[PDB]
Design a binder for these strands. Sequence first.
RNA 1: CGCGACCUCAGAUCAGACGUGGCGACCCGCUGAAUUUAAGCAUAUUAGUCAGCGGAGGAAAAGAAACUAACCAGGAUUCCCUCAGUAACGGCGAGUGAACAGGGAAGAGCCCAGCGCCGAAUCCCCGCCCCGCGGCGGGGCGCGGGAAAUGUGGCGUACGGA
RNA 2: CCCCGGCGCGCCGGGCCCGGGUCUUCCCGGAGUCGGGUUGCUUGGGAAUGCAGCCCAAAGCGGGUGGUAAACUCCAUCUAA
Lengths: 203, 38, 53, 99, 210
Amino acid sequence: GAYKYIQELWRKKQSDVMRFLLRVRCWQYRQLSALHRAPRPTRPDKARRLGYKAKQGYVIYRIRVRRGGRKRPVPKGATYGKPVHHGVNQLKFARSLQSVAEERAGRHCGALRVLNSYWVGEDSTYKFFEVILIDPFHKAIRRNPDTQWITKPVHKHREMRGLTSAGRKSRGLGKGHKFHHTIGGSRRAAWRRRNTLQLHRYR
Amino acid sequence: SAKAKRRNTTGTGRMRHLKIVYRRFRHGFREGTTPKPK
Amino acid sequence: WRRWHRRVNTTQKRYAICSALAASALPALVMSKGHRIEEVPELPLVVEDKVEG
Amino acid sequence: QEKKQRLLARAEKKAAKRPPVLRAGVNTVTTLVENKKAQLVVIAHDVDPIELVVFLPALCRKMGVPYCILKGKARLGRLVHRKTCTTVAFTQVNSEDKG
Amino acid sequence: APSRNGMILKPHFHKDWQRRVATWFNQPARKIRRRKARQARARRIAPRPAAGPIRPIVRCPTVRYHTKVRAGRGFSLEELRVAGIHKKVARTIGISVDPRRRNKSTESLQANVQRLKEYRSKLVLFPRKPSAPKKGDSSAEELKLATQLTGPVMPIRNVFKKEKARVITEEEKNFKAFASLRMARANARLFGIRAKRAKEAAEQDVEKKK
RNA sequence: CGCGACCUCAGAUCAGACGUGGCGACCCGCUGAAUUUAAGCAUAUUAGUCAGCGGAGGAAAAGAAACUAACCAGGAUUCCCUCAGUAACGGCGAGUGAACAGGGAAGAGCCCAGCGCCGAAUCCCCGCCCCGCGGCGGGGCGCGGGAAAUGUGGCGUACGGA
RNA sequence: CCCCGGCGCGCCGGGCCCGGGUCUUCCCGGAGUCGGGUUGCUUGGGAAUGCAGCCCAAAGCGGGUGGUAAACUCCAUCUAA
Ligand SMILES: [Mg+2]
Ligand SMILES: [Mg+2]
Ligand SMILES: [Mg+2]
Ligand SMILES: [Mg+2]
Ligand SMILES: [Mg+2]
Ligand SMILES: [Mg+2]
Ligand SMILES: [Mg+2]
Ligand SMILES: [Mg+2]
Ligand SMILES: [Mg+2]
Ligand SMILES: [Mg+2]
Ligand SMILES: [Mg+2]
Ligand SMILES: [Mg+2]
Ligand SMILES: [Mg+2]
Ligand SMILES: [Mg+2]
Ligand SMILES: [Mg+2]
Ligand SMILES: [Mg+2]
Ligand SMILES: [Mg+2]
Ligand SMILES: [Mg+2]
Ligand SMILES: [Mg+2]
Ligand SMILES: [Mg+2]
Ligand SMILES: [Mg+2]
Ligand SMILES: [Mg+2]
Ligand SMILES: [Mg+2]
Ligand SMILES: [Mg+2]
Ligand SMILES: [Mg+2]
Ligand SMILES: [Mg+2]
């Protein structure tokens, strides 16, 4: 039951123990490159409850993403339009920094399949995420029925289509009165349905 | 430029390999067999 | 998406089937439709059910 | 290797008791400590991430299980015929070794 | 511009609606495609009922529809438990199961339990191996007569209890439906405030007392 | 000093694999105007639309409730009819604008981590023998190599489970 | 007249040594996530529908929802990351 203790310990992120580990680890992650293959999960309990298994064909990558919002990439701040669209600062990006992290791992390792990721550190400038990827051609993966699903071509670049857990959170999905925007599967699916004129033969 | 996309899209050229795929598809991409000899 | 199709009420469609049948049993109307029925024994013309086979 | 010989010997015996052993793994040792079934817990000094065992010394003390810290997770690895081991535990010993 | 009397209209044609017009000329084609798949499915699963698994009886929510019963999604685990059908075995013999649904009242529960017992009585069960019958399998004489059922299985209907005419009693004549209705609304409206006023008075009187 | 484990990290035309580019009607993720309407115009509208970027598949996405309700209750997702130009939003102007219930199309449900028990009971690769071999797998044998106690496999997952 | 497929029936070598009910004793959950403030966008969502950045930062008869902000109190309904 060690994973029970570790999970609870990683909930005390302002304790003396955990603050010391986060601070020194963030320092160490900061001296490496923005994309860096990790030898093992820094968080074995968090990794495994996100689908990671300790077998050949599962790999970890540590991604560093710059913190903060999204500046509008217009020259000299000119947007050339109406005042409603003059904003340059204080704009936010539609997707989380964790999702950006997974996309940067998924794009680099185009032959792997991103599964999930998790938080490992941050300072004022960077957030650090470890991404769980799978090699879809290792026979430890192809011959396991419980992981054959992610070797299918329909699961190529999940992180790049908002399919991972981090990515799908910015899509406004969910059941109930809070998520009417995406009835039909997505915002555009709801829009097309609500904006298509049904002209029946007999009308 | 829709006009520019149809000047150099798939089909405008030779289809050297794609049009043999279209023929092979109709027989399930069979390989390693021949019609029964005379 | 021109409106190519028309709804006709069922009661009126059946009305139209009844008028067609009533007008089909009158020699004057059938002759006035161009049919050569000057020697048909009777109108309406009923034939035995053997013909169905 | 020698599990194969034990299994084959049982096959011959079938045709014609568990001795004490070290318990390895922070998950196995943890359950044993909580159950008070462990007699002595040996913990590697250089487990990394340290959170894997950072709680174990305090847990053993709460349960009254004697524990020690040893230099080298590789030395505990060599005991269990693996590269590394975070911690091991004695649950039972033979009578000649009780002292 | 408006012209004399008329209605004020706000057509929603201020977008590129012609880029998203859905015509229905494929409607006959869809009807033939769906029909051709119902038939091909009925042949595949024969002699199992073409409609599908038996569905329970449920009451429609809200006050506009709670007078009607319709087919639900699946039988509740309490209904299946009372009828002695294992929940994993239920689907294998054409019974639909809904683990989400709850049973708040007994009548609805017992209505669906009798439904399951009646369905179980009409079930003709072919042995897994044709040549080797087993304990629960139907007899060969009733396997010959087995035929595929069309339409929903044991269709659900709203049946009304006819009440015959009876002599009106003086107690029903003296009942005041409207006065009763108006006073019932008022009591519900003032129930909370009346108790609050009563509680204060008790405290108000108690303080003088002691 | 030397030797040996481990950890972290390197170089190999190392053995065997895999990604790249295209097409893009339909699909998913971003980013994203201004003509235009408001008889002016700045919010608003145009419009989450054009343009731009990324990623797919024969479909995609979604999907088995941290749901709807407030009923005598329903019961994953998607689609059709209706709800409904309605509740609501809006220089409350111009304009915009869903959901639940109800009737249908279809209908299918499941799996981990965790908590535990099982002597790691698990997996990959090499070499030899039999079978198959244009979808590279089945069985047998190796005091063959590695992975894996920093946790593989079997039981089991909220409908409870052991 | 060719070929491909589907559906059936036997042999060989393997794998499984498989379930229901009633009691008894035990066990049971996803965190820089929820939630809150603020900013920007977005929605019919209006003392703030969804999303995102920064700050704060959980609990365990708890947590979320219960379309008007908030305290107290019952209820209903689910079980997020
Ligand atoms: Mg946007
Ligand atoms: Mg899919
Ligand atoms: Mg969130
Ligand atoms: Mg005029
Ligand atoms: Mg090579
Ligand atoms: Mg104007
Ligand atoms: Mg004008
Ligand atoms: Mg102008
Ligand atoms: Mg504007
Ligand atoms: Mg808009
Ligand atoms: Mg475009
Ligand atoms: Mg592109
Ligand atoms: Mg591509
Ligand atoms: Mg393709
Ligand atoms: Mg989901
Ligand atoms: Mg549904
Ligand atoms: Mg109306
Ligand atoms: Mg709009
Ligand atoms: Mg509905
Ligand atoms: Mg139907
Ligand atoms: Mg487990
Ligand atoms: Mg559930
Ligand atoms: Mg969950
Ligand atoms: Mg915008
Ligand atoms: Mg808006
Ligand atoms: Mg309220």
